[PDB]
Amino acid sequence: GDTIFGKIIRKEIPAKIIFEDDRCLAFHDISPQAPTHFLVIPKKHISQISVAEDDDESLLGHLMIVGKKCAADLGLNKGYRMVVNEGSDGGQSVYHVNLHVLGGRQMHWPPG
């Protein structure tokens, strides 16, 4: 099923876009939990990390590389945390694979 992240990719609703290429999109989270909090999502609709295929390996890694490059561009030189949520226990809020990147403050432990 389609999600709000599909609409964001299709430019049907606005988002503050940080980076885009042919296979992913990075944009600021609408409900930020840190001074910097953005998402990196694939344009391919993978609903959750538990159903990702082996052929998706490069794409998932690309999200992380784009994530760390965006983090550097946004000035997160003291570090940051990357998060992927799966399912109910993981607190996944949208069923479209999304990598959170949070920084600009001390991140704590446990991570939720």
Next chain:
Amino acid sequence: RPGGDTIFGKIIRKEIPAKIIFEDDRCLAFHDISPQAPTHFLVIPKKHISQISVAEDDDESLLGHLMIVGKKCAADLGLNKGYRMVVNEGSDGGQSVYHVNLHVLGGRQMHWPPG
């Protein structure tokens, strides 16, 4: 020595014991010694990368492999209600071992924000 001399390098070379879940030529999954959830394990590359901020472009497939192995291990460990994957970078991330590692936590409701 291959893997570096961080604690994770020692674990990769079997010089320090760990409770290993899965191993292949590219990575290792093993339980965290200080778990923050009923199930809490780590997936690390065998190639030493100190932190995600210095990962090279050609490390893409390897990083993605960590996540694929992570989700496969979570399934094998019965985390059917879900889980959270975490990478800590640097001081603000709380990184304490400078060998890239993916945390996988499950077996309870995880909360928001993630720290």
